[PDB]
Amino acid sequence: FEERHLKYISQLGGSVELCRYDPLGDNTGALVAVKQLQPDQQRDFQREIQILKALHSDFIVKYRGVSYGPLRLVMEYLPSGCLRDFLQRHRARLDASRLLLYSSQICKGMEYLGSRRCVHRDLAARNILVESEAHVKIADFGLAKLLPLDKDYYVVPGQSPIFWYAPESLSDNIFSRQSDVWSFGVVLYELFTYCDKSCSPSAEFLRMMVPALSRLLELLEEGQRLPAPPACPAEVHELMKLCWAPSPQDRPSFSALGPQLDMLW
Numbered sequence: 370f371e372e373r374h375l376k377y378i379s380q381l382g383g384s385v386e387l388c389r390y391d392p393l394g395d396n397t398g399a400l401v402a403v404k405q406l407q408p409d410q411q412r413d414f415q416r417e418i419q420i421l422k423a424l425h426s427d428f429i430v431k432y433r434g435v436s437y438g439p440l441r442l443v444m445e446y447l448p449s450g451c452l453r454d455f456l457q458r459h460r461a462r463l464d465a466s467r468l469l470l471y472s473s474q475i476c477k478g479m480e481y482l483g484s485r486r487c488v489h490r491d492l493a494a495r496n497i498l499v500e501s502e503a504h505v506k507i508a509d510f511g512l513a514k515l516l517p518l519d520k521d522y523y524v525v526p527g528q529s530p531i532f533w534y535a536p537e538s539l540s541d542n543i544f545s546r547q548s549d550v551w552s553f554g555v556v557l558y559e560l561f562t563y564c565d566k567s568c569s570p571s572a573e574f575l576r577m578m579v580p581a582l583s584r585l586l587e588l589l590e591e592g593q594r595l596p597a598p599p600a601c602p603a604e605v606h607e608l609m610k611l612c613w614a615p616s617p618q619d620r621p622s623f624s625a626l627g628p629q630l631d632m633l634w
């Protein structure tokens with residue numbers, strides 16, 4: 370991908386821009402999403418490329434290549450954008466079976482990420498993209514880490530909204546496949562609230578809630594959790610409660626959650 374053939378359109382999300390790969394220079398070329406650095410950050414970015422280039426799933430945003438000119442990461446562009454805003458815009462159209470379809474695909478994608486020893490560390494509805502009405506894909510691999518063969522966890526202070534963090538990430542910066550399962554429980558809650566602002570993880574935790582991180586942690590240690598979303602099927606709420614188990618070892622695996630989500634449809 371020659372840099373001189375990548376034409377800027379707008380900003381999407383370091384930053385992600387909407388560009389057109391226009392070799393003919395006639396405004397007929399394909400639309401792409403291009404990520405760039407705006408030191409140690411160069412090492413973080415090279416890592417993101419290698420991780421994403423080695424991922425191959427219908428439920429993970431597709432790597433296209435890298436750019437060359439006088440380096441940028443080139444990926445596929447999904448016009449529908451993030452799942453958070455799509456859920457808010459199409460509230461009346463999506464029913465509990467469509468929400469369970471989205472839930473199942475995310476889970477299948479996470480199953481594949483853990484098979485590749487990859488911890489995402491930023492799983493949330495805002496970071497999932499919509500391919501079509503019936504197809505969702507996991508994105509934003511900016512905080513992704515690879516677990517060594519000898520280790521099952523990773524020790525990192527986080528700069529993401531604190532409401533998606535497992536207690537062991539809050540109290541000790543421990544990140545694992547099991548902290549991704551905690552976050553996933555928050556993704557289900559977000560899905561069944563249709564990413565409504567007034568009952569969002571931030572809104573509802575701040576109402577229930579020394580520093581803020583410590584207050585949230587005290588609350589979670591007490592066994593307090595987010596309430597069942599309005600009109601939530603009980604079976605779904607029981608699954609969120611399983612993902613929010615205090616001990617990482619007691620949380621269901623993505624391969625265990627998969628058939629349970631499919632059975633509900």
Ligand SMILES: *CCC(=O)Nc1cccc(CNc2c(C(N)=O)cnn3cccc23)c1
Pocket residue numbers: 381382385402430444445446447448449450451452453454495496497498508509
């Ligand atoms: C909900 C707000 C939002 O746009 N969030 C968001 C989440 C993850 C990633 C991005 C930017 N990236 C992006 C890609 C890509 N390949 O990373 C592809 N297609 N689109 C459409 C809109 C944004 C993106 C933003």
